[PDB]
Amino acid sequence: AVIKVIGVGGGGGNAVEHMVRERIEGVEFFAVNTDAQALRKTAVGQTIQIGSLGAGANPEVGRNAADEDRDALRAALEGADMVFIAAGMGGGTGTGAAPVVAEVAKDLGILTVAVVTKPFNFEGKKRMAFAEQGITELSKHVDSLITIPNDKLLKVLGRGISLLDAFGAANDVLKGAVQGIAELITRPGLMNVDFADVRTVMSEMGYAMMGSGVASGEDRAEEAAEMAISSPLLEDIDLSGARGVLVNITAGFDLRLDEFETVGNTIRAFASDNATVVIGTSLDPDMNDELRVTVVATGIG
Ligand SMILES: Nc1nc2c(ncn2[C@@H]2O[C@H](COP(=O)(O)OP(=O)(O)O)[C@@H](O)[C@H]2O)c(=O)[nH]1
Structure with missing residues:
Protein backbone atom coordinates (compact mmCIF):
# COMPACT_ATOMS: atom_id res chain seq x y z
CA ALA A 1 0.00 0.00 0.00
CA ARG A 187 -2.93 0.62 10.58
CA PRO A 188 -6.15 -1.42 10.82
CA GLY A 189 -7.71 -2.61 14.05
CA LEU A 190 -10.05 -5.54 14.66
CA MET A 191 -12.37 -4.67 11.77
CA ASN A 192 -10.21 -3.93 8.72
CA VAL A 193 -11.64 -2.34 5.57
CA ASP A 194 -10.57 -3.14 2.02
CA PHE A 195 -8.80 -0.58 -0.09
CA ALA A 196 -11.60 -1.26 -2.57
CA ASP A 197 -14.14 0.00 -0.04
CA VAL A 198 -12.11 3.13 0.58
CA ARG A 199 -11.86 3.47 -3.19
CA THR A 200 -15.62 3.08 -3.68
CA VAL A 201 -16.65 5.77 -1.16
CA MET A 202 -14.10 8.42 -2.29
CA SER A 203 -13.86 7.87 -6.04
CA GLU A 204 -15.35 10.37 -8.56
CA MET A 205 -17.68 11.80 -5.87
CA GLY A 206 -16.91 15.54 -5.63
CA TYR A 207 -17.63 17.52 -2.46
CA ALA A 208 -16.85 15.95 0.92
CA MET A 209 -16.67 17.08 4.55
CA MET A 210 -15.07 15.73 7.70
CA GLY A 211 -16.05 15.64 11.34
CA SER A 212 -14.39 14.15 14.41
CA GLY A 213 -15.23 13.25 17.99
CA VAL A 214 -13.42 11.64 20.90
CA ALA A 215 -14.77 10.17 24.14
CA SER A 216 -13.96 8.04 27.20
CA GLY A 217 -15.75 5.74 29.61
CA GLU A 218 -18.41 3.05 29.40
CA ASP A 219 -20.38 4.90 26.70
CA ARG A 220 -17.44 6.21 24.65
CA ALA A 221 -18.68 4.61 21.40
CA GLU A 222 -22.00 6.45 21.37
CA GLU A 223 -20.66 9.80 22.57
CA ALA A 224 -17.61 9.79 20.25
CA ALA A 225 -19.83 9.00 17.24
CA GLU A 226 -22.44 11.61 18.14
CA MET A 227 -19.75 14.21 18.78
CA ALA A 228 -18.41 13.54 15.28
CA ILE A 229 -21.89 13.90 13.77
CA SER A 230 -22.37 17.27 15.48
CA SER A 231 -18.83 18.50 14.78
CA PRO A 232 -19.00 22.16 13.64
CA LEU A 233 -17.14 21.12 10.48
CA LEU A 234 -20.28 19.12 9.57
CA GLU A 235 -22.83 21.71 10.72
CA ASP A 236 -24.49 22.69 7.46
CA ILE A 237 -24.36 19.16 5.96
CA ASP A 238 -27.36 16.85 5.82
CA LEU A 239 -25.61 13.50 6.32
CA SER A 240 -28.71 11.80 4.88
CA GLY A 241 -27.79 13.28 1.50
CA ALA A 242 -24.23 12.02 1.31
CA ARG A 243 -23.75 9.27 -1.28
CA GLY A 244 -20.74 7.90 0.59
CA VAL A 245 -19.79 7.67 4.24
CA LEU A 246 -16.40 6.50 5.51
CA VAL A 247 -15.97 5.94 9.24
CA ASN A 248 -12.67 5.37 11.08
CA ILE A 249 -12.86 4.12 14.68
CA THR A 250 -9.45 4.65 16.31
CA ALA A 251 -8.82 3.10 19.72
CA GLY A 252 -6.21 1.04 21.53
CA PHE A 253 -6.04 -2.66 22.25
CA ASP A 254 -9.23 -2.34 24.34
CA LEU A 255 -11.66 -1.82 21.48
CA ARG A 256 -14.67 -4.09 22.00
CA LEU A 257 -16.52 -5.63 19.09
CA ASP A 258 -19.76 -4.31 20.52
CA GLU A 259 -18.30 -0.79 20.44
CA PHE A 260 -17.69 -1.09 16.70
CA GLU A 261 -21.32 -2.18 16.20
CA THR A 262 -22.53 0.77 18.29
CA VAL A 263 -20.56 3.32 16.27
CA GLY A 264 -21.83 1.60 13.13
CA ASN A 265 -25.52 1.65 14.09
CA THR A 266 -25.33 5.27 15.23
CA ILE A 267 -23.78 6.45 11.96
CA ARG A 268 -26.16 4.31 9.87
CA ALA A 269 -28.98 5.92 11.84
CA PHE A 270 -28.20 9.30 10.20
CA ALA A 271 -27.09 7.92 6.83
CA SER A 272 -29.42 7.21 3.92
CA ASP A 273 -29.98 3.53 3.14
CA ASN A 274 -29.05 4.34 -0.47
CA ALA A 275 -25.52 5.39 0.48
CA THR A 276 -22.27 3.46 0.58
CA VAL A 277 -21.35 3.28 4.29
CA VAL A 278 -17.93 1.86 5.20
CA ILE A 279 -17.06 1.41 8.91
CA GLY A 280 -13.48 0.47 9.76
CA THR A 281 -11.19 0.57 12.77
CA SER A 282 -7.63 1.67 13.45
CA LEU A 283 -5.28 0.46 16.19
CA ASP A 284 -3.28 3.14 18.04
CA PRO A 285 -1.41 1.30 20.85
CA ASP A 286 -0.87 4.50 22.87
CA MET A 287 -4.55 5.39 23.15
CA ASN A 288 -5.71 3.84 26.42
CA ASP A 289 -9.29 4.74 27.40
CA GLU A 290 -10.02 7.18 24.56
CA LEU A 291 -12.02 6.35 21.44
CA ARG A 292 -11.90 8.50 18.30
CA VAL A 293 -14.61 8.44 15.61
CA THR A 294 -13.82 10.31 12.37
CA VAL A 295 -16.63 10.69 9.81
CA VAL A 296 -16.09 11.55 6.14
CA ALA A 297 -19.19 12.27 4.07
CA THR A 298 -18.55 12.24 0.32
CA GLY A 299 -20.77 12.86 -2.71
CA ILE A 300 -22.63 15.72 -1.06
CA GLY A 301 -24.94 18.03 -2.97
N1 LIG B 1 -2.57 24.93 7.52
C1 LIG B 1 -2.00 26.12 7.31
N2 LIG B 1 -2.60 27.03 6.48
C2 LIG B 1 -2.03 28.24 6.26
C3 LIG B 1 -0.77 28.56 6.94
N3 LIG B 1 -0.41 29.80 6.59
C4 LIG B 1 -1.35 30.27 5.74
N4 LIG B 1 -2.33 29.35 5.57
C5 LIG B 1 -3.50 29.55 4.69
O1 LIG B 1 -3.05 29.31 3.36
C6 LIG B 1 -3.44 30.35 2.49
C7 LIG B 1 -2.40 30.47 1.39
O2 LIG B 1 -1.20 31.00 1.92
P1 LIG B 1 0.20 30.40 1.44
O3 LIG B 1 0.13 28.88 1.42
O4 LIG B 1 1.33 30.96 2.29
O5 LIG B 1 0.28 30.98 -0.04
P2 LIG B 1 0.86 30.13 -1.26
O6 LIG B 1 2.19 29.50 -0.87
O7 LIG B 1 0.98 31.11 -2.40
O8 LIG B 1 -0.14 29.06 -1.69
C8 LIG B 1 -3.58 31.57 3.36
O9 LIG B 1 -4.66 32.36 2.84
C9 LIG B 1 -3.94 31.00 4.72
O10 LIG B 1 -5.36 31.00 4.88
C10 LIG B 1 -0.18 27.51 7.81
O11 LIG B 1 0.90 27.73 8.39
N5 LIG B 1 -0.84 26.35 7.95
Whole structure:
Protein backbone atom coordinates (compact mmCIF):
# COMPACT_ATOMS: atom_id res chain seq x y z
CA ALA A 1 0.00 0.00 0.00
CA VAL A 2 1.73 3.19 -1.27
CA ILE A 3 0.10 6.38 0.00
CA LYS A 4 1.69 9.75 -0.70
CA VAL A 5 0.82 13.06 1.01
CA ILE A 6 1.63 16.24 -0.97
CA GLY A 7 1.69 19.65 0.73
CA VAL A 8 1.48 22.44 -1.85
CA GLY A 9 2.45 26.07 -1.26
CA GLY A 10 3.30 27.60 2.08
CA GLY A 11 0.32 26.70 4.23
CA GLY A 12 0.14 23.14 2.94
CA GLY A 13 3.83 22.69 3.61
CA ASN A 14 3.29 23.69 7.23
CA ALA A 15 0.49 21.16 7.41
CA VAL A 16 2.44 18.16 6.14
CA GLU A 17 5.34 19.13 8.39
CA HIS A 18 2.86 19.02 11.27
CA MET A 19 1.78 15.58 10.03
CA VAL A 20 5.45 14.58 9.88
CA ARG A 21 6.09 15.83 13.43
CA GLU A 22 3.08 14.01 14.89
CA ARG A 23 3.41 11.03 12.48
CA ILE A 24 0.88 9.58 10.10
CA GLU A 25 1.81 5.92 9.82
CA GLY A 26 2.49 4.24 6.48
CA VAL A 27 2.53 7.24 4.13
CA GLU A 28 5.18 9.22 2.24
CA PHE A 29 5.36 12.99 2.69
CA PHE A 30 6.17 15.48 -0.10
CA ALA A 31 6.37 19.29 -0.04
CA VAL A 32 5.90 21.18 -3.32
CA ASN A 33 6.64 24.88 -3.49
CA THR A 34 8.17 27.65 -5.54
CA ASP A 35 9.96 29.28 -2.56
CA ALA A 36 13.22 27.33 -2.34
CA GLN A 37 13.98 28.77 1.11
CA ALA A 38 10.57 27.60 2.35
CA LEU A 39 11.44 24.06 1.29
CA ARG A 40 14.88 24.22 2.92
CA LYS A 41 13.37 25.24 6.26
CA THR A 42 10.76 22.45 5.98
CA ALA A 43 11.44 19.21 7.83
CA VAL A 44 9.79 17.04 5.16
CA GLY A 45 12.05 14.45 3.57
CA GLN A 46 11.02 14.93 -0.07
CA THR A 47 10.74 18.44 -1.49
CA ILE A 48 10.05 19.45 -5.09
CA GLN A 49 10.79 23.00 -6.21
CA ILE A 50 8.55 23.98 -9.13
CA GLY A 51 8.78 26.88 -11.53
CA SER A 52 11.28 29.17 -13.22
CA LEU A 53 7.25 41.49 -6.99
CA GLY A 54 3.98 40.86 -5.23
CA ALA A 55 3.69 38.25 -8.00
CA GLY A 56 3.99 35.19 -5.76
CA ALA A 57 0.45 35.74 -4.37
CA ASN A 58 -1.03 35.31 -7.88
CA PRO A 59 -2.47 31.81 -8.61
CA GLU A 60 -1.32 31.92 -12.24
CA VAL A 61 2.37 31.83 -11.33
CA GLY A 62 1.62 28.71 -9.30
CA ARG A 63 -0.21 27.08 -12.21
CA ASN A 64 2.45 27.99 -14.78
CA ALA A 65 5.20 26.89 -12.37
CA ALA A 66 3.62 23.45 -11.96
CA ASP A 67 2.77 23.14 -15.67
CA GLU A 68 6.50 23.65 -16.33
CA ASP A 69 7.37 20.80 -13.91
CA ARG A 70 4.67 18.20 -14.62
CA ASP A 71 7.33 15.58 -15.34
CA ALA A 72 8.96 16.22 -11.96
CA LEU A 73 5.53 15.98 -10.32
CA ARG A 74 4.74 12.86 -12.38
CA ALA A 75 7.91 11.14 -11.21
CA ALA A 76 7.25 11.84 -7.53
CA LEU A 77 3.68 10.54 -7.78
CA GLU A 78 3.94 7.43 -9.93
CA GLY A 79 3.54 4.09 -8.21
CA ALA A 80 1.04 5.42 -5.67
CA ASP A 81 -2.22 3.77 -4.69
CA MET A 82 -3.57 6.92 -3.03
CA VAL A 83 -2.46 10.55 -3.16
CA PHE A 84 -3.55 13.19 -0.66
CA ILE A 85 -3.14 16.82 -1.68
CA ALA A 86 -2.95 19.37 1.16
CA ALA A 87 -2.99 23.09 0.52
CA GLY A 88 -4.19 26.29 2.09
CA MET A 89 -6.26 27.88 -0.66
CA GLY A 90 -5.99 31.62 -1.10
CA GLY A 91 -2.35 32.17 -2.04
CA GLY A 92 -0.56 31.96 -5.35
CA THR A 93 1.25 28.63 -5.23
CA GLY A 94 -1.33 26.39 -3.52
CA THR A 95 -4.29 27.86 -5.40
CA GLY A 96 -2.54 27.49 -8.75
CA ALA A 97 -0.30 24.42 -8.40
CA ALA A 98 -2.55 22.07 -6.38
CA PRO A 99 -4.98 21.42 -9.31
CA VAL A 100 -1.99 20.67 -11.56
CA VAL A 101 -0.67 18.25 -8.93
CA ALA A 102 -4.15 16.72 -8.85
CA GLU A 103 -4.53 16.40 -12.63
CA VAL A 104 -1.13 14.71 -12.78
CA ALA A 105 -2.16 12.23 -10.09
CA LYS A 106 -5.53 11.52 -11.69
CA ASP A 107 -4.10 11.19 -15.23
CA LEU A 108 -1.90 8.43 -13.76
CA GLY A 109 -5.10 6.85 -12.45
CA ILE A 110 -4.40 7.23 -8.74
CA LEU A 111 -7.17 7.68 -6.21
CA THR A 112 -6.72 11.39 -5.53
CA VAL A 113 -8.14 13.15 -2.47
CA ALA A 114 -7.82 16.90 -1.77
CA VAL A 115 -7.86 18.34 1.73
CA VAL A 116 -7.71 22.13 1.70
CA THR A 117 -8.72 25.17 3.73
CA LYS A 118 -10.60 28.37 2.88
CA PRO A 119 -9.00 31.47 4.44
CA PHE A 120 -10.22 33.26 7.54
CA ASN A 121 -12.44 36.23 6.80
CA PHE A 122 -9.82 38.68 8.13
CA GLU A 123 -7.54 37.70 5.24
CA GLY A 124 -9.55 39.86 2.84
CA LYS A 125 -11.93 39.43 -0.08
CA LYS A 126 -9.10 38.88 -2.56
CA ARG A 127 -7.84 35.72 -0.90
CA MET A 128 -11.38 34.41 -0.34
CA ALA A 129 -12.03 34.78 -4.09
CA PHE A 130 -8.69 33.29 -5.16
CA ALA A 131 -9.49 30.36 -2.88
CA GLU A 132 -12.88 29.79 -4.50
CA GLN A 133 -11.57 29.89 -8.08
CA GLY A 134 -8.80 27.48 -7.06
CA ILE A 135 -11.17 25.02 -5.40
CA THR A 136 -13.32 25.08 -8.55
CA GLU A 137 -10.33 24.11 -10.67
CA LEU A 138 -9.24 21.52 -8.07
CA SER A 139 -12.70 19.88 -7.97
CA LYS A 140 -12.31 18.90 -11.66
CA HIS A 141 -9.23 16.71 -11.10
CA VAL A 142 -9.87 15.05 -7.70
CA ASP A 143 -11.90 12.05 -6.65
CA SER A 144 -12.94 13.72 -3.39
CA LEU A 145 -12.43 17.32 -2.26
CA ILE A 146 -12.60 17.94 1.50
CA THR A 147 -12.92 21.64 2.31
CA ILE A 148 -12.20 23.17 5.72
CA PRO A 149 -13.43 26.76 6.05
CA ASN A 150 -10.98 28.16 8.59
CA ASP A 151 -13.68 30.28 10.26
CA LYS A 152 -15.35 27.12 11.61
CA LEU A 153 -12.19 26.50 13.70
CA LEU A 154 -12.84 29.75 15.55
CA LYS A 155 -16.12 28.18 16.70
CA VAL A 156 -14.14 26.19 19.30
CA LEU A 157 -11.16 28.54 19.78
CA GLY A 158 -12.32 32.14 20.00
CA ARG A 159 -10.63 34.68 22.28
CA GLY A 160 -7.81 36.91 21.08
CA ILE A 161 -6.15 33.72 19.90
CA SER A 162 -2.68 33.79 18.38
CA LEU A 163 -2.28 33.80 14.61
CA LEU A 164 0.26 31.05 15.36
CA ASP A 165 -2.51 29.13 17.10
CA ALA A 166 -5.23 29.70 14.51
CA PHE A 167 -3.05 28.16 11.78
CA GLY A 168 -1.90 25.39 14.11
CA ALA A 169 -5.56 24.42 14.41
CA ALA A 170 -5.93 24.26 10.62
CA ASN A 171 -2.77 22.11 10.46
CA ASP A 172 -4.38 19.78 12.98
CA VAL A 173 -7.65 19.31 11.13
CA LEU A 174 -5.92 18.74 7.79
CA LYS A 175 -3.82 16.08 9.52
CA GLY A 176 -6.93 14.48 11.03
CA ALA A 177 -8.64 14.16 7.66
CA VAL A 178 -5.57 12.57 6.07
CA GLN A 179 -4.90 10.29 9.05
CA GLY A 180 -8.60 9.45 9.44
CA ILE A 181 -8.68 8.06 5.90
CA ALA A 182 -5.14 6.69 5.52
CA GLU A 183 -4.64 4.72 8.76
CA LEU A 184 -7.75 2.66 8.11
CA ILE A 185 -5.54 1.06 5.45
CA THR A 186 -2.05 1.36 6.96
CA ARG A 187 -2.93 0.62 10.58
CA PRO A 188 -6.15 -1.42 10.82
CA GLY A 189 -7.71 -2.61 14.05
CA LEU A 190 -10.05 -5.54 14.66
CA MET A 191 -12.37 -4.67 11.77
CA ASN A 192 -10.21 -3.93 8.72
CA VAL A 193 -11.64 -2.34 5.57
CA ASP A 194 -10.57 -3.14 2.02
CA PHE A 195 -8.80 -0.58 -0.09
CA ALA A 196 -11.60 -1.26 -2.57
CA ASP A 197 -14.14 0.00 -0.04
CA VAL A 198 -12.11 3.13 0.58
CA ARG A 199 -11.86 3.47 -3.19
CA THR A 200 -15.62 3.08 -3.68
CA VAL A 201 -16.65 5.77 -1.16
CA MET A 202 -14.10 8.42 -2.29
CA SER A 203 -13.86 7.87 -6.04
CA GLU A 204 -15.35 10.37 -8.56
CA MET A 205 -17.68 11.80 -5.87
CA GLY A 206 -16.91 15.54 -5.63
CA TYR A 207 -17.63 17.52 -2.46
CA ALA A 208 -16.85 15.95 0.92
CA MET A 209 -16.67 17.08 4.55
CA MET A 210 -15.07 15.73 7.70
CA GLY A 211 -16.05 15.64 11.34
CA SER A 212 -14.39 14.15 14.41
CA GLY A 213 -15.23 13.25 17.99
CA VAL A 214 -13.42 11.64 20.90
CA ALA A 215 -14.77 10.17 24.14
CA SER A 216 -13.96 8.04 27.20
CA GLY A 217 -15.75 5.74 29.61
CA GLU A 218 -18.41 3.05 29.40
CA ASP A 219 -20.38 4.90 26.70
CA ARG A 220 -17.44 6.21 24.65
CA ALA A 221 -18.68 4.61 21.40
CA GLU A 222 -22.00 6.45 21.37
CA GLU A 223 -20.66 9.80 22.57
CA ALA A 224 -17.61 9.79 20.25
CA ALA A 225 -19.83 9.00 17.24
CA GLU A 226 -22.44 11.61 18.14
CA MET A 227 -19.75 14.21 18.78
CA ALA A 228 -18.41 13.54 15.28
CA ILE A 229 -21.89 13.90 13.77
CA SER A 230 -22.37 17.27 15.48
CA SER A 231 -18.83 18.50 14.78
CA PRO A 232 -19.00 22.16 13.64
CA LEU A 233 -17.14 21.12 10.48
CA LEU A 234 -20.28 19.12 9.57
CA GLU A 235 -22.83 21.71 10.72
CA ASP A 236 -24.49 22.69 7.46
CA ILE A 237 -24.36 19.16 5.96
CA ASP A 238 -27.36 16.85 5.82
CA LEU A 239 -25.61 13.50 6.32
CA SER A 240 -28.71 11.80 4.88
CA GLY A 241 -27.79 13.28 1.50
CA ALA A 242 -24.23 12.02 1.31
CA ARG A 243 -23.75 9.27 -1.28
CA GLY A 244 -20.74 7.90 0.59
CA VAL A 245 -19.79 7.67 4.24
CA LEU A 246 -16.40 6.50 5.51
CA VAL A 247 -15.97 5.94 9.24
CA ASN A 248 -12.67 5.37 11.08
CA ILE A 249 -12.86 4.12 14.68
CA THR A 250 -9.45 4.65 16.31
CA ALA A 251 -8.82 3.10 19.72
CA GLY A 252 -6.21 1.04 21.53
CA PHE A 253 -6.04 -2.66 22.25
CA ASP A 254 -9.23 -2.34 24.34
CA LEU A 255 -11.66 -1.82 21.48
CA ARG A 256 -14.67 -4.09 22.00
CA LEU A 257 -16.52 -5.63 19.09
CA ASP A 258 -19.76 -4.31 20.52
CA GLU A 259 -18.30 -0.79 20.44
CA PHE A 260 -17.69 -1.09 16.70
CA GLU A 261 -21.32 -2.18 16.20
CA THR A 262 -22.53 0.77 18.29
CA VAL A 263 -20.56 3.32 16.27
CA GLY A 264 -21.83 1.60 13.13
CA ASN A 265 -25.52 1.65 14.09
CA THR A 266 -25.33 5.27 15.23
CA ILE A 267 -23.78 6.45 11.96
CA ARG A 268 -26.16 4.31 9.87
CA ALA A 269 -28.98 5.92 11.84
CA PHE A 270 -28.20 9.30 10.20
CA ALA A 271 -27.09 7.92 6.83
CA SER A 272 -29.42 7.21 3.92
CA ASP A 273 -29.98 3.53 3.14
CA ASN A 274 -29.05 4.34 -0.47
CA ALA A 275 -25.52 5.39 0.48
CA THR A 276 -22.27 3.46 0.58
CA VAL A 277 -21.35 3.28 4.29
CA VAL A 278 -17.93 1.86 5.20
CA ILE A 279 -17.06 1.41 8.91
CA GLY A 280 -13.48 0.47 9.76
CA THR A 281 -11.19 0.57 12.77
CA SER A 282 -7.63 1.67 13.45
CA LEU A 283 -5.28 0.46 16.19
CA ASP A 284 -3.28 3.14 18.04
CA PRO A 285 -1.41 1.30 20.85
CA ASP A 286 -0.87 4.50 22.87
CA MET A 287 -4.55 5.39 23.15
CA ASN A 288 -5.71 3.84 26.42
CA ASP A 289 -9.29 4.74 27.40
CA GLU A 290 -10.02 7.18 24.56
CA LEU A 291 -12.02 6.35 21.44
CA ARG A 292 -11.90 8.50 18.30
CA VAL A 293 -14.61 8.44 15.61
CA THR A 294 -13.82 10.31 12.37
CA VAL A 295 -16.63 10.69 9.81
CA VAL A 296 -16.09 11.55 6.14
CA ALA A 297 -19.19 12.27 4.07
CA THR A 298 -18.55 12.24 0.32
CA GLY A 299 -20.77 12.86 -2.71
CA ILE A 300 -22.63 15.72 -1.06
CA GLY A 301 -24.94 18.03 -2.97
N1 LIG B 1 -2.57 24.93 7.52
C1 LIG B 1 -2.00 26.12 7.31
N2 LIG B 1 -2.60 27.03 6.48
C2 LIG B 1 -2.03 28.24 6.26
C3 LIG B 1 -0.77 28.56 6.94
N3 LIG B 1 -0.41 29.80 6.59
C4 LIG B 1 -1.35 30.27 5.74
N4 LIG B 1 -2.33 29.35 5.57
C5 LIG B 1 -3.50 29.55 4.69
O1 LIG B 1 -3.05 29.31 3.36
C6 LIG B 1 -3.44 30.35 2.49
C7 LIG B 1 -2.40 30.47 1.39
O2 LIG B 1 -1.20 31.00 1.92
P1 LIG B 1 0.20 30.40 1.44
O3 LIG B 1 0.13 28.88 1.42
O4 LIG B 1 1.33 30.96 2.29
O5 LIG B 1 0.28 30.98 -0.04
P2 LIG B 1 0.86 30.13 -1.26
O6 LIG B 1 2.19 29.50 -0.87
O7 LIG B 1 0.98 31.11 -2.40
O8 LIG B 1 -0.14 29.06 -1.69
C8 LIG B 1 -3.58 31.57 3.36
O9 LIG B 1 -4.66 32.36 2.84
C9 LIG B 1 -3.94 31.00 4.72
O10 LIG B 1 -5.36 31.00 4.88
C10 LIG B 1 -0.18 27.51 7.81
O11 LIG B 1 0.90 27.73 8.39
N5 LIG B 1 -0.84 26.35 7.95
